[PDB]
Amino acid sequence: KALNFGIISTESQQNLKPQWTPFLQDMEKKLGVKVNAFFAPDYAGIIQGMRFNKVDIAWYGNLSAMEAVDRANGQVFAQTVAADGSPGYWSVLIVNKDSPINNLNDLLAKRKDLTFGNGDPNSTSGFLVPGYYVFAKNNISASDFKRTVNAGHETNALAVANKQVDVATNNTENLDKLKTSAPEKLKELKVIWKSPLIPGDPIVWRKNLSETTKDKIYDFFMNYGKTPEEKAVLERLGWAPFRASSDLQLVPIRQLALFKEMQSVKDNKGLNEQDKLAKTTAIQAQLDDLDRLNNALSAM
Template identity: 35%
Template sequence: MKRLSALFRPLALCLSLISASSTFAAQPLTVGLIPAEDSQAMLENSKKVIDSLQEQLGMPVKPFIATDYNGIIEALRSKKLDVAYLGPFSYVLATSIANVEAFSVAETKKTGKSSYKSLIIVRKDSGIETVPQLKGHTMAFVDPSSASGHLFPTAGLQKQGIEPSKYFSRVIFSGSHDASILAVANKKVDAAAVADRIFAAAVAKGIIKQADFNIVWTSPDIPESPMVWRKDLDPELKKKIATAFANIKNVEWGDQGVLNGFVPTNDAAYNVVRDTAKILNLDLKAMK
């Protein structure tokens, strides 16, 4: 009997490994997406990236879109998400309350860079051409945690001695860059702070016409929105995820347009965002 047991032990071990592998493959990888656009558009525009990940990893990949940035951060903190696409500032906020780190960032074919800018836009027929002319007008930001849709433009305005809450007659948070652009286009607000690539995407889609707008302020370069993962993910799974993202090239991804690919990044790349938070005297943990 002992001899038979010894003979069957390798077979039992093999079956155990197969079973474990099958279980691992059957578990979905959950990926959170920031609400840069409306939920349905975000899902449709991320489909090629999600499909590529699923094919390369050999496991289901389940996308998740929250109604705001904090929804994604909370899902990471509570381990309901494995990987997420976050804005630069929402990433810095996430690192203060969740066990996450940036590992990859998209490089767009259009710019060949992994950075972008914030714009303050107005309707051309408003007659506004400079920041000083915005005084007493209405302003739309995207989300309190949005880098290009709130924090960088606020820091830029403060450098000019402008406190938005006192300078504008009314300030709103629209919830998405698209909503802010349309708010200006439809004369719901006089000005809005948005990401340059999302504004360009709206022009390319024919949603708005470039000629109908003036750009009255442009930010310095902002590090592109990173892909982040929970630090406690299995190391082997992390390697597979990083390799899978590195292999995603020449596909369209939402407002990013066609990608050159995803390139490695790290936490230190977002220190410029932390520095901006210091300019604004922000308590990151208090913003959750």
């Protein structure tokens, strides 16, 4: 009967509950069923919950949604939209305002002496996007820093603010939620690198939900936001009304995942040729498929 709604650990539950509870209470009123929040210590807990039918619908990032579609019987059906009109969000590297580091060059030059707060291994902005553009494209490794730990966006931002880690990954959403959870902390941060645009986060359901359940859920998302009270709830989440979506929104993250695999395989001093060819062509086939799909979407 009750629905379980998975919420990724971008922030503490303490900070998430006040944004999410009124939304899930509105969902309950409209679906006529109980809706329970499902949290986990990392993104993998939501994906695994969905794989085992313990999570029915979830808010994911694009990378964790990709893994849920591939591994957890997931399907995207809606996309979040920034309340401020931004067309997606961006990944960043942050250091403290008192750091003499001002750009990626200065960072990489001193990496052996600096501690690094990397993201959740399933985070688009926390892990994959800096993982390709900062590390892979520079032929370096998070292991090349003095010390590295993985943590969620809120933990990383506060550790940099609090001078507990020298640099960390983060994102522009999470930085804006600092204006709420922790404002004098935002003033202690300085962005030294910003990614290309990342698409807005998907909402995903498990494909084995009934037809009538999906229709009710989809109607709820597509129509949410039409009243004053729903507008106020979206505003607190940092969102405008949702957009219809599909697994096609994941293409640029699939591409980025294969690009990282490619830049890795090609920077790999430890394969021969019969075998750097075989692996290169297998990743290339997949990239070609996504390029052709993109060409098709463009020409529609």
